[PDB]
Design a protein around this ligand. Structure first.
Ligand SMILES: NC(=O)c1ccc[n+]([C@@H]2O[C@H](COP(=O)([O-])OP(=O)([O-])OC[C@H]3O[C@@H](n4cnc5c(N)[nH+]cnc54)[C@H](O)[C@@H]3O)[C@@H](O)[C@H]2O)c1
Ligand SMILES: NC(=O)c1ccc[n+]([C@@H]2O[C@H](COP(=O)([O-])OP(=O)([O-])OC[C@H]3O[C@@H](n4cnc5c(N)[nH+]cnc54)[C@H](O)[C@@H]3O)[C@@H](O)[C@H]2O)c1
Ligand SMILES: NC(=O)c1ccc[n+]([C@@H]2O[C@H](COP(=O)([O-])OP(=O)([O-])OC[C@H]3O[C@@H](n4cnc5c(N)[nH+]cnc54)[C@H](O)[C@@H]3O)[C@@H](O)[C@H]2O)c1
Ligand SMILES: NC(=O)c1ccc[n+]([C@@H]2O[C@H](COP(=O)([O-])OP(=O)([O-])OC[C@H]3O[C@@H](n4cnc5c(N)[nH+]cnc54)[C@H](O)[C@@H]3O)[C@@H](O)[C@H]2O)c1
Ligand SMILES: O=c1[nH]cnc2c1ncn2[C@@H]1O[C@H](COP(=O)(O)O)[C@@H](O)[C@H]1O
Ligand SMILES: O=c1[nH]cnc2c1ncn2[C@@H]1O[C@H](COP(=O)(O)O)[C@@H](O)[C@H]1O
Ligand SMILES: O=c1[nH]cnc2c1ncn2[C@@H]1O[C@H](COP(=O)(O)O)[C@@H](O)[C@H]1O
Ligand SMILES: O=c1[nH]cnc2c1ncn2[C@@H]1O[C@H](COP(=O)(O)O)[C@@H](O)[C@H]1O
Ligand SMILES: [K+]
Ligand SMILES: [K+]
Ligand SMILES: [K+]
Ligand SMILES: [K+]
Lengths: 342, 342, 342, 342
C-alpha cells in the first residue's frame, strides 16, 4: 500500500560532467508529439489567463507551441486557431474536454487547421477519458493527440494504448492547483515524469511535464527526468501577450492568474484558486531568460542535445539544507536578476 | 540516473573524541597547492568586492593568501600582484579566465611574481577549461596552478591529469550564487568536497573548498570532509580591507557584495546577484574569530594538525531538528557574540 | 521673531465654484519666464537622475521644458542642449552654478542655443548668487534667466532686482531634500509660493514652484497659490525617459533618484540623500494623468485659463482629520489608479 | 491658569535671509558662561553614559566642553577633572548635586582646577537648589557656576539672582526623560529657551539649551530661540569616546544610554529609562557633521556669528504637514547620510 518515496524539483540536483558544449552552442530542438517538433521545449498551458492566439503566436515565433484554451465558444476557438495558422504558418494547439458532447468542437478545430489536439483532463487514467481518446483516434487517425494528465507508469501505458501521440504528466503540482490538498491524491513531479517516461520511452512517445515549473532549473530537471518538453502556466501568466489587463496593486502591476478548476473559471468543489501574477513584459524576454538557464545546464552536464539531457544526465538527492545552500543565502539582496526574483 | 544522497554543512556534525590538544596549541598550518604552504587554511575569493592588493596583504599577514580578481586591466592586475610582493615578500595569487585570449594576462602576472595562478571557471570539467590548464602547464611547468571549479570525483581527476597543483571545489553553494536554481545543476558542498578529495588524496593534491562558508563551524566541517583549506567570499566581504566604500542603510553600515556572474559584474543570463554585506571592521579580527572556532574544534576532536582533522575526524548526520537544537533556541538574545550574529 | 504660521499642500483645499469650464476645454497654457510660454505648466528638475536630453525632448513634445543638469562636462552639456534644439524645433533649458568660474559653461550653453538659463542654488538670497545673476544679465542682456531658490517676498524682490526673468521657489520641500532638518531652515511650500508671488506679480515676473509635488492636486494648489508653473523631480524620476537603468528589487522595478546635495552627487555636509523610485513607464502617460487632474480642478473652480486659477481660486485651511478624509479611508484598496498609487 | 501655547523644534522653521555669509566663513564661537568662551556651541551632558574624561578631552579638542558626571567617588571625579586639565591645556566642567552635604565634593573639584561647576537638578526653581547656589557663590566667589534646570522666565530670574554664571534650560525634553509623562510637568523646549533668554539677556547671562536635540537643525533653532549653546546627551552617547563598551544586538552595534533619573542610575520614582544608542564612531566626526549643519544654517540666515543667529533670525510656525514635507518623503531611501539616519 505504501509504494515508495517520491520526489520533486527541490529534492534533486543535476550532476555536472565532462562537456564540450558551450551554452550558446546547445541545441534546444525537441519533440512535442511523435510527429511534431519544437525549437525549444516549452508549451503554454491551456488556461484562460495564459493562452489565446496572441500568446500562441509569440510563443510559436520563439520556437514553442501554445494550446488555445476551451473557455470560449467553438466559433471563437476555431477563429483563434485560424489566426495563429494565418500568422506565418505557425504551429498551434488547442484543448478540449474529455466529456461527451465535444465532437463538434474537435471537428471545428481540426477544420480550422489545428496541429495538435489536447484532450486535457485532471484524470487521464479515467475510463471515460481513455474512451474519448479511442474515439478521437478512430475519427481522426492522423491527428497528433496529446492526452493526460497522468502521474504513473500504468497511466502512461493506458494513454499510449488508447492512441495518444504524447503523454502529459502532472497531478496537483501547478502553482494554483489545490487537488492534492482537496483530494489527497497526486505524485511529486520528478517521480511522476520518470515513471511515465520509463514506459513512454518504449513506444517512442514523448512526455510533457505539466505543472510546478518556477525557475529555469526546474525545466532542466523536468527534462533530465525524461520529459521532452514542459508545459507552463504561471511562468507565462503575467506576460504582455497573456490574456487580460494589467491591474495595479500596492505599487505593482499584475495580471490575473487562475486555475481552470477554480470557481471563477468553472462558471461541486474547486481544485484551484484565483490569484495575481506580476507583470513581466514581453514573453520573448522571459523565454530568453528561461532558455538561457537551460543552455547553461546543458553546458554544465555536457548535453549537446535535449536528448542527451533527457536520457543521460544524473541527479543527486538533496535535503532541506542542500536547497537553502542552493538559493541565495546569508546576504541582503539589493539588485535581483530577471531570472531570480520575488 | 539518481546517484545517491548528498549533504552540506547543516546536514552533519563532527564527533568529539579523546584529545590531548588544547585550542591554543592546535597547529593550523596546511597546504594550498602541492608546493605552497599556508599558516591558516583560508583564502579569499577572486571577487571584485572581496580581493584586491589591500585585502590580499592583510590576509597574507595573518597567514592566508588572497586571489587578486580579474575585473581590471592586465596592467592593474600585475601592479596589484607586485604591490603584495613588495609588501614584505608576502604570497599572492591571481585569477584569470578560462577563455582563449588570456595568455597575455597570465604572462604579465607571472612576470609580476605571482605565486599561484588560479584558472577560475564555473565549469572546471569543460574541455575548454582543461585545454587551457594543459597549455598553461606546458608554458609554465613550474607555476603552481589552481583549477576548478568541480563538484565530483571525475572532475577532480580530470583537473589533476590536466596539470593542476590544486583542485577547487564548489558549484553553486556561494552566498550570492544562483547557478543551482538557474540551471538545476550542482552538488551539496560536503559531498562535493569528499568526492573530490577521495580522488585528489591519491595524487597528493590539495582540495580547496570554495563557497557556502557562513560560520566558523563550516570551516571545520569543510576540512574534515577532505579540504586542505577553504575559499571564502561573503565572510570577508564587508571588511575594511575589502574593496569598496561603506554604505549607510537603515541605521547600519554595509559594503557591496556581488557575484562575479551578476549583471553588474559581467558589464546572456546571470548566475549571481548583487547585495550588501554588513561592515565588519578589520579583517584581522574576523580571522581571529573564525580561527578561534576552528582551534576549538581541533581541541574537541583531538586533532593536533589540520591533517588530523582532514583525515581522521568523524561526522554524524543530523535532521532539521538537530540543526535547530544546534543554534541558539528558546531564548531571546540580547547580546550577540562576534562569531554568532544576524 | 516668530512671524506667522506657514502652510503647505496638505494644509489646504481649493474651493469649488460656479463653472462654465470643462476638463477638456480648460486652457493649460502659461508662462515659464517673462518671454517664454508653455503649453502646460510643468518643468523638469535639473538633476542627474531626472533630466538629460532624452527626457527634455519628451517633456517638450508634451508642452513643457526640461532643464539639463550640470553634472557633466561643459561639452557634454552643450551637445545635450543642441540635441534637444535639433529635435523637432523644441525649447530647452540648462542649469549652471552660481560658483564663480561658471562663465565658460554659460558661454557654451548660450552658443548651443539654450532658450533659458537656470542659475540654481539653494540660496538665491545669497549675495554671491545675486552678483552672478547681475553679471550674467550684463553679459547676456536678452538671455531668459531663472534665479532661485527663494522662500520669501524679499528674496523674490532681490532676484527680480538683479535681473531674473523668473523666480524659482522652494527651500527644502523636495522629496529627497533634508535641508530643513540639517539646517533648521525653510518655509512650507504654499506660504513660500504666495509670499514670493505677491512681489513678483507686481513685476509681471512668473514664479516657478519647485519641490514637494506628489499628487496632481499639489500642481493645482501650487498654481492657485501664485505659481505659473511647477518644477518636479521625483514625479518624473523613474520614467523610461529619465536617466539611469532599471533596478529590480524585491519583485518591482525602480530607477535611482537622488538629491543634487547628496554625497554621491557632490562627488560641508549633505542636504539630500539617495533613493529609488518606482519605474513609471513613458513620461507621456505620467503627464497625461497629472494634467487630467489639473483640468478636472479647473473645471471644479471655474478656472478657464491657468491665470484664473493662479489669481482667483479660493482655499480653505484643513486639519489632519480633513486630510485623512481626503485620501481613501476605511477600505482595502484592490485596484489602484494610475494617479493614486502606493 | 492656561497661559499660552508653547512650542518646540518640530513646530518651527527658520527663515532664510539676505546673506553675505558662507558656511565655511561662519564664526562659531560663543559663550558657555559669563566668563568662559567656546569655539563651538556644544556641551556634553553630565551622564554616566555620556561624559567621562575621555569624551571630555575629545570634545575640548573640538571646541566644546564636557561635564564630568557625579556618579563616582569624590576622588574618582577629581582625578577625572585633573586628567582633562593636564591634556593639552583643556577646559573642563563637573557636575554636583544640590543635595546638602555636597560641600566636600565641590572642594575637591575646585582643588582639581575645574573651570566650571554645574549644580544640576531637575528643579532649579527649587528653594533648596537656590540656596546651594547662594552658599556655593559665597564660598567660591570666582567660580563659574551653571545653575538649572529651569523652563521659565521667573526660574531664569531666580537662578541669576542667586549668583549663577549661566542658566541651563530644560524640563523633560530629553530623549530618555519621562518627567513630563510621570509628573505632567514641563515646557516645550523652544518656548522654554525663549522665555528664559528674555530675562537672562537683560543680565548678559548666557542660556544653555539642555535636551531634546536630535538633528543639526535643532542646534540652529535652539540658538535662534536665545541659547548661547546646547547641551547634548543622546547625540554623543554611542560615540567611541563615551563610556561603556560596545554591545552587539541584532547585527548592529550599540552602547548603553540611560537617564540619570532611571532605576539603574539611582542605584520616589524614576523619571528616565534605560536604552541603547547606535554606535557612531569618533566624536570628532559627529561634531563635524553637526557643526556643518549649523554653518549651512548661518549661511542661509545671514548670521555671521552665533550672536546674530541668537538675536536676529526669524521663525515661522509650521503644521504636522510642514514637518512631513521637511523630512524625506515619498521615496525609499537606499543610502543615508551621516547627518540623516534611521
Ligand atoms: N493536473 C491537475 O492536477 C488538475 C486537477 C484539477 C483540474 N485541472 C485543470 O482544470 C480543469 C478542470 O476540469 P477537470 O475536472 O480536471 O476535467 P474535466 O474536463 O471536467 O473532466 C473530464 C473527465 O475527468 C474524469 N475524472 C474522473 N475522476 C475525476 C476527478 N475526481 N476529478 C476530476 N476529473 C475526474 C472524468 O472522466 C471526466 O469526464 C482542466 O482544464 C484541468 O486542466 C488540472
Ligand atoms: N562556482 C560556481 O558555481 C560559479 C557559477 C557561476 C559563476 N561563478 C563565478 O562567476 C564568474 C562567471 O564566469 P563563468 O561563466 O563561471 O566562467 P567563464 O570564465 O566566463 O567561462 C570559462 C569557461 O567555462 C566553461 N563552461 C562550459 N559550460 C558552462 C556553463 N554552462 N556556464 C558557465 N561556464 C561554462 C567554458 O569552457 C568557458 O569558456 C567566475 O569568476 C566564477 O568564479 C561561479
Ligand atoms: N532647493 C533646496 O532647498 C536645495 C537645498 C540644497 C541643495 N539643493 C540643490 O542641490 C544642488 C547643490 O547646490 P547648493 O548646495 O544649492 O549650492 P551650490 O550650487 O554649491 O552654491 C551656490 C551658492 O549658494 C550660496 N550660499 C550661501 N549660503 C549658502 C548655504 N548655507 N547653502 C547653500 N548655498 C549657500 C553661495 O553664494 C553659493 O556660491 C543644487 O542643484 C541645488 O538646486 C537645493
Ligand atoms: N532636566 C530634567 O528634566 C530632569 C528631570 C529628572 C531628572 N533629571 C536628571 O537626573 C538626575 C537626577 O537628579 P534630580 O531628580 O534632577 O534631582 P536631585 O539631583 O536628586 O535633587 C536636586 C534638588 O531638586 C529639588 N526638587 C524639588 N522638587 C523636586 C522635584 N519634584 N523633582 C526633583 N527635584 C526637586 C530639591 O531641592 C532637590 O534637593 C540629574 O542628573 C538631573 O539632571 C533631569
Ligand atoms: O484548477 C486547476 N486545478 C488543478 N490544476 C490546474 C488547474 N488549472 C490549471 N491546472 C494545471 O496547472 C498547470 C499550470 O501549472 P503552473 O505552471 O505551476 O502554473 C496547468 O497546465 C494545468 O495542468
Ligand atoms: O556570480 C557568481 N555565480 C556563481 N558563483 C559565484 C559567483 N560569484 C562568485 N561565485 C562563487 O562564490 C564563491 C564565494 O561564495 P561565498 O563565500 O558563500 O560568498 C566564490 O569563491 C565563487 O566560487
Ligand atoms: O540635495 C538636495 N537638497 C535640497 N534640495 C534638493 C536637492 N536636490 C534637489 N533638490 C531640490 O528638490 C527638487 C525636487 O523635489 P521633488 O520634486 O519633491 O522630488 C529639485 O527641483 C531641487 O529644487
Ligand atoms: O533621568 C532623567 N530624567 C529627566 N531628564 C534627564 C534624565 N537624565 C538626563 N536627563 C536630562 O536629559 C538630557 C539629555 O537629553 P538628550 O540630549 O535628548 O538625550 C540631560 O542633559 C539632562 O538634562
Ligand atoms: K547559492
Ligand atoms: K544550541
Ligand atoms: K476621500
Ligand atoms: K524634504
Amino acid at each position: 500500500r505504501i509504494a515508495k518515496e517520491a520526489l520533486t524539483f527541490d529534492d534533486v540536483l543535476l550532476v555536472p560532467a565532462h562537456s564540450t558544449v558551450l551554452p550558446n552552442t546547445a541545441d534546444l530542438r525537441t519533440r512535442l508529439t511523435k510527429n511534431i517538433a519544437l525549437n525549444i521545449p516549452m508549451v503554454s498551458a491551456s488556461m484562460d489567463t495564459v493562452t489565446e492566439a496572441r500568446l500562441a503566436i509569440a510563443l510559436a515565433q520563439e520556437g514553442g507551441i501554445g494550446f488555445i484554451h476551451k473557455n470560449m465558444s467553438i466559433e471563437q476557438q476555431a477563429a483563434q486557431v485560424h489566426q495563429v495558422k494565418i500568422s506565418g504558418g505557425l504551429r498551434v494547439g488547442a484543448a478540449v474536454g474529455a466529456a461527451p458532447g465535444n465532437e463538434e468542437r474537435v471537428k471545428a478545430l481540426v477544420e480550422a487547421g489545428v496541429d495538435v489536439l489536447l484532450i486535457d483532463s485532471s484524470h487521464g487514467h479515467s475510463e471515460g477519458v481513455l474512451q474519448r481518446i479511442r474515439e478521437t483516434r478512430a475519427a481522426y487517425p492522423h491527428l497528433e493527440i496529446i492526452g493526460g494528465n497522468v502521474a504513473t507508469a500504468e497511466g502512461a501505458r493506458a494513454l499510449i494504448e488508447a492512441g495518444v501521440s504524447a503523454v502529459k504528466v502532472g497531478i496537483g503540482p501547478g502553482s494554483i492547483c489545490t487537488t492534492r490538498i482537496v483530494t489527497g491524491v497526486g505524485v511529486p513531479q520528478i517521480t511522476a515524469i520518470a515513471d511515465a517516461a520509463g514506459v513512454a520511452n518504449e513506444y517512442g512517445i514523448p512526455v510533457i511535464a505539466d505543472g510546478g515549473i518556477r525557475f529555469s532549473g526546474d525545466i532542466s530537471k523536468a527534462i533530465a527526468a525524461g520529459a521532452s518538453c514542459v508545459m507552463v502556466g504561471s511562468m507565462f501568466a503575467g506576460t504582455e501577450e497573456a490574456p487580460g489587463e494589467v491591474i495595479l496593486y500596492q505599487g505593482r502591476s499584475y495580471k490575473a492568474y487562475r486555475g481552470m478548476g477554480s470557481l471563477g473559471a468553472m462558471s461541486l468543489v474547486p481544485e484551484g484558486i484565483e490569484g495575481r501574477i506580476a507583470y513581466k513584459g514581453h514573453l520573448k524576454e522571459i523565454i530568453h531568460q528561461q532558455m538561457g538557464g537551460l543552455r547553461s545546464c546543458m553546458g554544465l552536464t555536457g548535453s549537446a542535445t535535449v536528448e542527451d539531457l533527457r536520457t543521460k544526465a544524473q541527479f543527486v538527492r538533496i535535503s532541506g539544507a542542500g536547497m537553502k545552500e542552493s538559493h541565495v543565502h546569508d546576504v541582503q539582496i539589493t539588485k535581483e536578476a530577471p531570472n531570480y526574483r520575488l
